[PDB]
Amino acid sequence: MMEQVCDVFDIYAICACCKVESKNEGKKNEVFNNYTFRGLGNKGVLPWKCISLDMKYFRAVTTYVNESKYEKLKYKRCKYLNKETKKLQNVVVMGRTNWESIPKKFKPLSNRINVILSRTLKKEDFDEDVYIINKVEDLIVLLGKLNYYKCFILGGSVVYQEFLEKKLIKKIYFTRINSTYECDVFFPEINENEYQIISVSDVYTSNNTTLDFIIYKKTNNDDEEEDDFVYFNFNKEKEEKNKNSIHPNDFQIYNSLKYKYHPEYQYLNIIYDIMMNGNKQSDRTGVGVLSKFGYIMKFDLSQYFPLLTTKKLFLRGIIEELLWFIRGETNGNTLLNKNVRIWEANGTREFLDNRKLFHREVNDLGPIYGFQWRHFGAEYTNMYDNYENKGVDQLKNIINLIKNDPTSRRILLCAWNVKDLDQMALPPCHILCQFYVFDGKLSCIMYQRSCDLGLGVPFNIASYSIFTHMIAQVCNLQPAQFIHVLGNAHVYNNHIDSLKIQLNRIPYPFPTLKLNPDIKNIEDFTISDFTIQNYVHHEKISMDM
Amino acid sequence: MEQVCDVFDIYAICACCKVESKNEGKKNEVFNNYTFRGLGNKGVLPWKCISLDMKYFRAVTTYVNESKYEKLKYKRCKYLPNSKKLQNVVVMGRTNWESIPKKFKPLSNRINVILSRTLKKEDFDEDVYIINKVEDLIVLLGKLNYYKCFILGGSVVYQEFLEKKLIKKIYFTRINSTYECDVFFPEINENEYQIISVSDVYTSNNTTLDFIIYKKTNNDDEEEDDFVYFNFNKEKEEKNKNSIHPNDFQIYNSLKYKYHPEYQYLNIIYDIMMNGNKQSDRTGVGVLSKFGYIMKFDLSQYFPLLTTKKLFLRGIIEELLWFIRGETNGNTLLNKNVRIWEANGTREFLDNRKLFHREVNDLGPIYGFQWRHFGAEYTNMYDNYENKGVDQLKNIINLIKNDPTSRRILLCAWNVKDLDQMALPPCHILCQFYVFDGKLSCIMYQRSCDLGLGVPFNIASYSIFTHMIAQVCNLQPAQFIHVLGNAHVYNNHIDSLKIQLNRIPYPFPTLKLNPDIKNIEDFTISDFTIQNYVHHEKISMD
Ligand SMILES: NC(=O)C1=CN([C@@H]2O[C@H](COP(=O)(O)OP(=O)(O)OC[C@H]3O[C@@H](n4cnc5c(N)ncnc54)[C@H](OP(=O)(O)O)[C@@H]3O)[C@@H](O)[C@H]2O)C=CC1
Ligand SMILES: NC(=O)C1=CN([C@@H]2O[C@H](COP(=O)(O)OP(=O)(O)OC[C@H]3O[C@@H](n4cnc5c(N)ncnc54)[C@H](OP(=O)(O)O)[C@@H]3O)[C@@H](O)[C@H]2O)C=CC1
Ligand SMILES: COc1ccc(OC)c(CNc2ccc3nc(N)nc(N)c3c2Cl)c1
Ligand SMILES: COc1ccc(OC)c(CNc2ccc3nc(N)nc(N)c3c2Cl)c1
Ligand SMILES: O=c1ccn([C@H]2C[C@H](O)[C@@H](COP(=O)(O)O)O2)c(=O)[nH]1
Ligand SMILES: O=c1ccn([C@H]2C[C@H](O)[C@@H](COP(=O)(O)O)O2)c(=O)[nH]1
């Protein structure tokens, strides 16, 4: 009915939060909620030294104005005050402490109307072109007399709190710094019943830390080439002809989001597309699946490590497997003895017998990945044989091509050995890896013939990202893009419920990957040379239930 | 100041097909936008029925956006109760009116109007208006409540409405098939009207077609700023890359909507020219390259034979039949005058590959061999490999017929053990097939792609191959998915591609296979026919 202050005057809040230094309740499996990011400052200044990307975003946002949109805002505000009818600027409001924490050479903030809240100080105490007020109410009166686009609360713990309590914030531009720092001041705890995240930005790395930008929003407790657009969609099928019996509320949150730019959405959007338009098919098992054919995902390893955050994932296993491949092993016992059971089910007497591998020893997986990577072509005997210098050593070959013929368009690693397929516990899901080198950067494409979106893919994305880092390092290059190509992409029916829950979880800024820098050979890597940092994630999910 | 067509929104909507050359003039045919002009024949439409165009016709003429009518009203009277429903005015010639079935008459949800000098208002409804001449229309439009005015016209109506510069936009449907006609839509003056949009290509009632738009040449709010914010770190541009001038792509960038499938190919080229990386190559020519692209063609709606330049197919079909037989002898192709593999079989090239003991044109264990004898020991192109190695081609055909849901239906030409013995490693790594509801789809991964010369043929080769497999499996072709690894453009092709990107695609042709061929091994060069292939003139990339 009657407009609210924050809407007429367009008062927004903008901030940057990191992870507080809670000693620990045990870094041993800690819960993560949005409240995880709340570190505002320490000892009167910022907890972190410098994060230029946040500064850049901060300046970009608080200074942008759209001239052509002001006229409409003028009417809004005047009409509200019952009032009939320099370059346009935004207004920034900051508490005294916050103001004093900013280096002289930056004050007053350029191209913005600075406003300062304070009691202890008055106009006489400032030499700068700045407005002083001692009552939040005073700011409202002021906005009514100024010509401005939008009003941002640059904050201060105190300032943020009262503005949220007085419910004067329309939106919260929140920067999530994904690293921990000592802090003495914190951002208020946002009430999800008052505010809900509506947009999540891409993830980036700046000054040794990943970070992203999300937007909280207050919740209710030419024109011709536009008609032509409508025309071209004249054949788009109607509604109630989508493909499956998926309910609306099933993805309430997921669809509430305006901008889903976080990389994890490349994966999540595929899960969604399959659930909405997938094809009903039976499979090698009997569970049945929803499937689509042909997808592609790209991850910028230079800005982050794509370890899904909408659910917990462990990497010790997939790393041991990767190391296991590199060694050219095919002995399933080697993994089991490290308590990794990725290949256990495919090495049992039963499994092997079903594959007509009657004379194969339990856990003797046959000429799979490892063997094909180091000995493609060699006649396979048993997992205990010495295959030294037999078969093509593909791994060695691609690492040499990356080093001495980087522009080669023949740097491929193929595990699909048509001749040995049958002798394998099962044909490889990851067919090949093609490498690309430019300006000292390594990118990698991996084609997957079969993809289990629910359980497999999340691990696959991680595996080949780590492998890219590995190949890149021993080749003296920086990892670039990991492009994942899916062939038969399917979601198992007994997974549909967990994934519905997953698509309604908002992603956290990705973590990072650190390899021991001393390892100069693809072969000398060991489990302790790998370290995942700042992995903020949602609660673990059991797909099968 | 003001121009009538801008105030009253007078548009033209039509559908034209191709007209018989009338057996006169037998040379190598040339095409142009005027190729599509057939309007009608014997008071009726040149064709039996094309429901899709019908659906487009109705949808366009009946569409109305009431929330935008006010602005129009403002503009109209500022120039100059009774309809709970705002509608559009459709002006049609007498003949055209008569030719319309009675059951549909007084075009539902459209303020009907007729041009005639014989029809007397009396014998007509109060609704169905009628006029004495062109100029009289403007008057009725000023005294009415309508959204937009569409000229369903007739050859005469169209002609005049154009000479009198009254048309703003033309919604032209391009019917890609030939019929006999007696009346034809006037030739559009490129200096006055130009295409700004091209739609996706479709197949309706046994013919392909697309929708294009001609434009008269002139010669909420909060998540909006949020969008801008999210671009704060946008490549901080304003610095040209790869030295590619603005106007080099005037026509290409002038288009608003490019939904034609061909743009999937054209856009990749554009992307490589604007952002490709400069690299040297095993040829010393240099290229611009990017890594990882994907294209998708709905084989059920058209055959993706590029139209922005002429492409011949006899060669690539022979190469395909050559693969299916499992041959590795380049002489077979050269004797049919298909020189696709000629350079790869010369003494020099073979010697450069360190294949000093290989006969000229003996390409080694390439595609053919790998498809029917993977794993067999390659000796020479004349040896008998009958039943040696794995016959993958046969296995996937069986997998498609007896285990359609299998996720192991792949044909792989990249045999790591035999790579060095090949005149050269396969560019087309593999093919994966997918089956659902009696439809067949194919994904082909290409490790190296010469966007300028090779990709165009590549797209066609595997599209045809998908058709071939589907048929011998009693399935209908669906999608052909092309995954590009290293995608590059040769520097000496750039100027040619600059010319190409500025050409506007024609609706795609169609591929017809001899229905009698029931086994992959039984196809012959005559079992393939490309129909209705309208294309631009040839271009020599070099
Ligand atoms: N990471 C981020 O994005 C941000 C971090 N910060 C950090 O926060 C810390 C500062 O926060 P904090 O200590 O809470 O200080 P604030 O910046 O909130 O300043 C509090 C002071 O502002 C004044 N004030 C607040 N409300 C009113 C009012 N209604 N009327 C009159 N005066 C008012 C008073 O000044 P007086 O004493 O004169 O009466 C008050 O003591 C710093 O370390 C700074 O670096 C700040 C902004 C953003
Ligand atoms: N493919 C397509 O999109 C279309 C195809 N067609 C086809 O075209 C053929 C009909 O075309 P065509 O012969 O041009 O017929 P039209 O439908 O244009 O009708 C022409 C008649 O309209 C009247 N007329 C024309 N100009 C004027 C004017 N200035 N003032 C008053 N009346 C005027 C005359 O009627 P009068 O005799 O009373 O003076 C005239 O003979 C048919 O076969 C039809 O199927 C028609 C429309 C679209
Ligand atoms: C030019 O402005 C400055 C220069 C240096 C600074 O460090 C002490 C500061 C501190 N303020 C500062 C720094 C970063 C910020 N980042 C965000 N996302 N939001 C803020 N609201 C904000 C603020 Cl207030 C500002
Ligand atoms: C329901 O309306 C109709 C049913 C059948 C018709 O032709 C016999 C017609 C009239 N002819 C007709 C048919 C198709 C058309 N299609 C387009 N893109 N533009 C036209 N201007 C047009 C026209 Cl005039 C209308
Ligand atoms: O790293 C892996 C390993 C396996 N799978 C899945 C794919 C299939 O769901 C199943 C193997 O069945 P086939 O595709 O081979 O039929 O395992 C993955 O998604 N990722
Ligand atoms: O059907 C074909 C055959 C070849 N090529 C191109 C790709 C490369 O430009 C060149 C092969 O050289 P390498 O990439 O292998 O170096 O031939 C195509 O684009 N399409």
Q: What is the CATH number of the domain that holds A248?
A: 6.10.250.2210
Enumerate helices (H) and strands (E) in chain A, giving the number of each.
16, 20
Collect contacts of B495-498 with beta carbons under 8 A, ≥24 apart: B496/B452, B496/B539, B496/B540, B496/B541, B496/B542, B497/B269, B497/B273, B497/B451, B497/B452, B497/B541, B498/B248, B498/B249, B498/B273
Is B96 close to ligand 4, i.e. is its CB under 6 Å away?
yes
Q: Do A234 and B59 touch (CB under 8 A)?
A: yes
Task: Based on the fold, state whether residues A41 and A169 are members of the same structural domain.
Answer: yes
* Interface size, chain A vs chain B, as Cβ–Cβ contacts under 8 Å: 193
Q: Which residue has the tokens 């907890």?
A: A47
Which residue in A150, A228, A289, A468 has the most chain B C-beta atoms within 10 A of its own C-beta, making it the best mutation to test that interface? A228
Q: Which residues contact A82 (CB under 8 A, 6 or more apart)?
A: none
State the distance from the centre of ligand 5 to the C-alpha of B407, rounded, in angstroms.
Answer: 9
Q: Known catalytic residue: B431?
A: no
**Short-list A59, A218, A50, CA closest to B229:** A59
State the distance from the centre of ligand 1 to the C-alpha of A22, rounded, in angstroms.
Answer: 23
Q: Which residues contact B192 (CB under 8 A, 6 or more apart)?
A: B165, B216, B217, B219
Q: Which residues contact A249 (CB under 8 A, 6 or more apart)?
A: none
Which residue puts its alpha carbon closest to atom 16 of ligand 6? A409
Catalytic (active-site) positions of A: 429
Q: Which two tokens stand for residue A524?
A: 């000398």
Which residue puts its alpha carbon closest to atom 27 of ligand 1? A117
Q: Do A409 and B485 touch (CB under 8 A)?
A: yes
- Give the C-alpha distances (Å, rounded to integers) separating B310 from A125, B114, B300, B305, B464: 78, 44, 22, 9, 17
Choosing from B260, B290, B324, the residue where a domain stops is B260
**Residue A458: CATH number of its domain:** 3.30.572.10
Choosing from B203, B234, B260, the residue where a domain stops is B260
- Facing residues of A115 across strands? A93, A131
Task: Based on the fold, state whether residues B271 and B238 are members of the same structural domain.
Answer: no
Report d(CA B415, CA B365) in Å as an integer.
9
Which atom of ligand 6 is nearest to B486's Cα? Answer: 14
Q: Which amino acid is at B15?
A: A
Q: Do A407 and B291 touch (CB under 8 A)?
A: no
Q: One of B14, B427, B442, B449 is an active-site residue; which one?
A: B427
Is A188 close to ligand 1, i.e. is its CB under 6 Å away?
no
Burial environment of residue A239 by CB neighbours within 10 A (0 to 12, 13 to 18, 19 or more)? exposed
Task: Based on the fold, state whether residues B212 and B80 are members of the same structural domain.
Answer: yes
Q: Which of A60, A234, A490 sits opposite B232 (nearest CB)?
A: A60
Q: Which of A294, A392, A418 sits opposite B412 (nearest CB)?
A: A418
- Give the C-alpha distances (Å, rounded to integers) separating A286 from A244, A282, A494: 19, 6, 11
Domains held by chain A: number: 3
**Short-list A370, A331, A359, CA closest to A347:** A331
Experimental method: X-ray
Task: Based on the fold, state whether residues B42 and B107 are members of the same structural domain.
Answer: yes
Can you give the residue range of the structural domain that contains A423?
A: 263-545
Which atom of ligand 6 is nearest to B488's Cα? Answer: 9
Please report the resolution in angstroms. 2.7
What DSSP state is assigned to residue A494?
G
Q: Which two tokens stand for residue B300?
A: 């059920």
Task: Based on the fold, state whether residues A302 and A182 are members of the same structural domain.
Answer: no
Task: Based on the fold, state whether residues A182 and A97 are members of the same structural domain.
Answer: yes
**Residue B152: CATH number of its domain:** 3.40.430.10
Report d(CA B271, CA B293) in Å as an integer.
10
State the distance from the centre of ligand 3 to the C-alpha of A204, rounded, in angstroms.
Answer: 18
Is B213 close to ligand 4, i.e. is its CB under 6 Å away?
no
CA dihedral B362, B364, B365, B369 (to 10 degrees): 0
Q: Which residues contact A322 (CB under 8 A, 6 or more apart)?
A: A463, A466, A467, A470
CA dihedral B187, B189, B195, B198 (to 10 degrees): 10
Report d(CA A73, CA B73) in Å as an integer.
25
Nearest 5°: the CA angle A129, A131, A134 is: 150
Which residue in B428, B486, B488 has the most chain A C-beta atoms within 10 A of its own C-beta, making it the best mutation to test that interface? B486
Task: Based on the fold, state whether residues A390 and A498 are members of the same structural domain.
Answer: yes
Task: Based on the fold, state whether residues A479 and A359 are members of the same structural domain.
Answer: yes
Task: Based on the fold, state whether residues A57 and A103 are members of the same structural domain.
Answer: yes
Instruction: Produce one character per residue of B83-102: b if its CB has 16 or more CB atoms within 10 Å, e if not.
Output: eeebbbbbbbbbbbbeeeee
Choosing from A219, A249, A281, the residue where a domain stops is A219
If you measure CA to CA, which chain B residue comes closest to A447? B445
What DSSP state is assigned to residue B371?
H
If you measure CA to CA, which chain B residue comes closest to A59? B232
Task: Based on the fold, state whether residues B420 and B437 are members of the same structural domain.
Answer: yes
Burial environment of residue B304 by CB neighbours within 10 A (0 to 12, 13 to 18, 19 or more)? buried
Task: Based on the fold, state whether residues B16 and B62 are members of the same structural domain.
Answer: yes
Is A207 close to ligand 3, i.e. is its CB under 6 Å away?
no
3-state secondary structure of B208: strand
Q: Which helix (H) or strand (E) holds B56?
A: helix B51-62
* DSSP symbols for A55-101: HHHHHHHHH---HHHHHHHHHHHHHHTT-------EEEEEEHHHHHT
Q: How many CB atoms lie within 10 A of CB A193?
A: 8
State the distance from the centre of ligand 5 to the C-alpha of A285, rounded, in angstroms.
Answer: 11
Q: Which two tokens stand for residue A245?
A: 């019996």
3-state secondary structure of B287: strand
Task: Based on the fold, state whether residues A342 and A257 are members of the same structural domain.
Answer: no
Q: Which two tokens stand for residue B460?
A: 């066609």
How far, rounded to the nearest angstrom, does the alpha carbon of residue A216 sit from its chain's CA centroid? Answer: 18
Q: Which helix (H) or strand (E) holds A219?
A: none
